[PDB]
Write a protein that binds this ligand. Structure first.
Ligand SMILES: O=C1O[C@H]([C@@H](O)CO)C(O)=C1O
Ligand SMILES: [Fe+3]
Length: 862
């Protein structure tokens, strides 16, 4: 690769780091690029999981231990002589499982910040503050205001006398040993609430109130970090930054954040990143260059820290950090934070006793941390799950004979008819269908009748191979749960490495075109082979050692094709041609019913199904707002549209499942008991889209299920030019005919639809049946909080109450009522979410569903 890509947050001094990068290009001739991507917390583990991303990542050490569990970070091997150049505790912050996993850069912690004019000598102890507030109240001021809403800010006091998140021992944090409940933590929080009850502090004080008050000279003290200094620097306040007050003679223990630089485990530039960080960045001039852009605060490098500590504010930061506790670098901190946030809010407001608040927090944090471990175990079993065994040597031989017989029938039939047909559409793979004509001779669906424009059909790209052998066909059919029309289908093998490369190229082309079908996407398209009118399946083959995660410890089958040995196969795409009939009648009828009854909501794209639109404050049950209203306002049958949606989802599913037996297996694996009532019928669909003569840019979906179904049907007669569905990383494209369905892995296969031009009245209706997991999780959560069957009654009540406010007092009053409901809903969702209530099985590393399922390992030993 011979280059270095670095990700750092936008709030840091990246241009200063970019200057350090130049000086690196000088000596080694290696370019250093420094990007600052938004949502960086979540972006790195999602991209690094696939062997992609930067060489170097810059973030707080706390996240890095989770990354280390996922093997996304390289073990750094610094010499004992380099390790001396940094404070030993900062090295402790970047240790996971005996191993060093990142380079410490900067050190941050809360300090006491005080107004020098109101308070020349800040108190040494918390115990003095009540007396000090009494004095300052007489002058119309207050002693102390800081954020009471987030436990980060209140924890220093709580930790002082004892009290910790998880007990650290032998290089590990004990998940089962939470320190929320001890006498130490109890005393700390007691003192905090005593300050509130004795009117020294207000329970509603948040970050903004505290910052405003201190920066305007209204309060003598606040508690904040180095990020807050810039704002105070613009104000009239003469301020100092000092050691946090002691409690019962012990130091307040703020959490310590260590900004760190980790090396990507999938980076080919490991020894040159080691070079860059050790010799160019972790030096006085190195950190100086960064410091001059945006200040680092305290730093891990002893020599430069001695310089910075000349600023008393930096000195105070380090001192508080050393008296503090390194923030645990494990994901189970989320459990700690939610439970402690609830406890502090409750104890401060009087909703619970300090003793009651901490007792519940201890119990809940331990429970939630235990469950999250259990969920990670189960996810591994999900990723590694195998289809029910249908494959055997005798079964594949049997199936190959059947398939061979069917190929002869299909040939004889083709001979008799003068060629191949999909419905009435003449199918010739020598040609690419660039435009085509549909006729509508009756009120049924318009039918593809004639190829209009064509070019000679481009060959398959080199990484995609049509499978010739019936034995191999039967091998894959039986192992992958795919049963296409006998003698009338093609199977393909796609090289997994090249598939991922082509995905990247496709995304690049769309970006270059400016998020649109332009020249670069067109050039890719010109290389895609037409499979219009075909029934096809694409298997990807992963070589045993990536985007794909097969378990090579899984059971192996013996392939008839030796080229499959040492490889795992998964189904990435399947194109079906549904014969016009009862099922297509039912499906198209439901679309018409849902369109007529105003049940498609506009987001463009029209949508329906079991959504939960959280932007709608009053939404508390499954569906779009139109669905909620119809359940109430209907004078015939409240459930009518839900019967329609279930039949729609179930009929499409049934058609797909006849051909793809892995689909119900996927449904059963990833939909939880709590998610089932919020899926549309017995399917893996919760949302259904609808498009009218529309293209869509090439893209990967992110927050959808493992497989997505798309179908098309046509309404009037006419000619359509363009509008191909394109799978550029598979090197194929097609025109939808009478009733074409594609089932494909939408999170891992790039896809889109070219713009259309039409002649006549022809409408091509496109529709995706998919799993949008955010809706099913939130709904499963609401179901756990209120009861699945209570949601309709809540929705009816919430609609009535919002209507009343509008009818009585205006739009403003009603939207305030909706705003109230939204907060209450939020709190309920949040509480269930903390209890690990889920609608679907998800990757704890990525927060997404697995990239594929049901991998089959093939091995042919001699
Ligand atoms: O290429 C696409 O076309 C369909 C659209 O017709 C239905 O939404 C969709 O899901 C895309 O990603
Ligand atoms: Fe899509």
């Amino acid at each position: 690769e011979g280059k270095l890509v670095i990700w750092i947050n936008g709030d840091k001094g990246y241009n200063g780091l970019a200057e350090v990068g130049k000086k690196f290009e000088k000596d080694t001739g290696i370019k250093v690029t420094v990007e600052h991507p938004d949502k960086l917390e979540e972006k790195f583990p999602q991209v690094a999981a696939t062997g992609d991303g930067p060489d170097i990542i810059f973030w707080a050490h706390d996240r890095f231990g989770g990354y280390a569990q996922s093997g996304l970070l390289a073990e750094i091997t610094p010499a004992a002589a380099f390790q001396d150049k940094l404070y030993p505790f900062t090295w402790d912050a970047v240790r996971y499982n005996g191993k060093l996993i990142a380079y410490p850069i900067a050190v941050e912690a809360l300090s006491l910040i005080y107004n020098k004019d109101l308070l020349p000598n800040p108190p040494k102890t918390w115990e003095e503050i009540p007396a000090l507030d009494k004095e300052l109240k007489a002058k119309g001021k207050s002693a102390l205001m800081f954020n009471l809403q987030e436990p980060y800010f209140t924890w220093p006091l709580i930790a002082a006398d004892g009290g910790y998140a998880f007990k650290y021992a032998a290089g590990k944090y004990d998940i089962k040993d939470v320190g929320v409940d001890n006498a130490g933590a109890k005393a700390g929080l007691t003192f905090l609430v005593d300050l509130i009850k004795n009117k020294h502090m207000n329970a509603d004080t948040d970050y903004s109130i505290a910052e405003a008050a201190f920066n305007k000279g209204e309060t003598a003290m606040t508690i904040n970090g180095p990020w807050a200094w810039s704002n105070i620097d613009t104000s009239a306040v003469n301020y100092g930054v000092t050691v946090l007050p002691t409690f019962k003679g012990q130091p307040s223990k703020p959490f310590v954040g260590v900004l760190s630089a980790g090396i990507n485990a999938a980076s080919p530039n490991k020894e040159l990143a080691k070079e860059f960080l050790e010799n160019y960045l972790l030096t006085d001039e190195g950190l100086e260059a960064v410091n001059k852009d945006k200040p680092l605060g305290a730093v891990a490098l002893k020599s430069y820290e001695e310089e910075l500590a000349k600023d008393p504010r930096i000195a105070a930061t380090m001192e508080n950090a050393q008296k503090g506790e390194i923030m645990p670098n494990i994901p189970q901190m989320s459990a700690f934070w939610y439970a402690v946030r609830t406890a502090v809010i409750n104890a401060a407001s009087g909703r619970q006793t300090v003793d009651a608040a901490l007792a519940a927090a201890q119990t809940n944090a331990a429970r939630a941390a235990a469950m999250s471990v259990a969920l990670a175990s189960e996810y591994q079993l999900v990723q590694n799950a195998q289809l029910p065994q249908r494959w055997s040597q005798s079964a594949r031989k049997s199936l190959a004979i059947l398939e061979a017989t069917a190929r002869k029938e299909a040939t004889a039939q083709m001979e008799a008819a003068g060629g191949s047909f999909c419905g009435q559409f003449p199918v010739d793979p020598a040609f690419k269908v660039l435009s085509l004509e549909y006729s509508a001779p009756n009120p049924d669906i318009a039918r593809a009748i004639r190829r209009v424009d064509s070019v000679p059909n481009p060959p398959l790209p080199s990484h995609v191979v049509a499978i010739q052998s019936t034995a191999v066909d039967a091998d894959l059919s039986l192992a992958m749960g795919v049963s296409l029309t006998p003698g009338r289908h093609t199977s393909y093998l796609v090289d997994a490495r090249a598939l991922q490369q082509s995905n990247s190229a496709a995304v690049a082309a769309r970006k270059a075109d400016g998020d649109k079908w332009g020249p670069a996407c067109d050039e890719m398209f010109r290389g895609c082979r037409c499979v219009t009118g075909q029934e096809v399946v694409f298997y990807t083959a992963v070589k045993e050692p990536s985007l794909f995660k097969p378990s090579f410890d899984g059971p192996a089958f013996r392939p008839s094709w030796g080229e499959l040995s040492g490889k795992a196969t998964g189904v990435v795409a399947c194109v079906l041609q549904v014969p016009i009939g009862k099922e297509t009648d039912i499906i198209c009828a439901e679309y018409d019913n849902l369109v007529s009854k105003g049940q498609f909501a506009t987001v463009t794209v029209n949508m329906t199904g079991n959504a939960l639109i959280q932007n709608d404050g009053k939404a508390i049950s499954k569906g779009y707002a139109v669905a909620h209203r119809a359940r109430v306002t209907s004078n015939v049958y409240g459930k009518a549209n839900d019967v329609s949606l279930q039949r729609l989802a179930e009929t499409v599913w049934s058609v797909v499942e006849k051909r793809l037996s892995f689909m119900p297996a996927y449904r059963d694996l990833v939909i939880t008991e709590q998610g089932k009532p919020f899926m549309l019928g017995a399917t893996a669909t919760n949302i259904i889209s609808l498009t009218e003569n529309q293209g869509v840019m090439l893209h990967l979906d992110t927050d959808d299920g493992v497989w997505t179904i798309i179908l098309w049907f046509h309404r009037h007669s006419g000619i359509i030019a363009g509008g191909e569905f394109v799978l550029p990383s598979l090197g194929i494209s097609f025109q939808p005919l009478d009733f074409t369905i594609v089932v494909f892995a939408a999170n891992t296969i790039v896809h889109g639809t070219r713009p259309l031009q039409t002649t006549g009245k022809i409408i091509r209706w496109g529709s995706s049946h998919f799993l949008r997991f955010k809706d099913v999780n939130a709904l499963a959560q609401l179901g756990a909080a209120y009861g699945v069957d209570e949601l309709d009654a809540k929705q009816r009540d919430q609609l009535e109450e919002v209507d009343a406010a509008n009818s009585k007092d205006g739009v403003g009053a009603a939207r305030r009522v909706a705003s109230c409901m939204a907060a209450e809903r939020k709190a309920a969702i949040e509480a269930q979410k903390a209890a690990c209530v889920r609608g679907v099985v998800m990757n704890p590393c990525t927060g997404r569903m697995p990239s594929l399922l049901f991998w089959q390992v093939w091995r042919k030993p001699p």
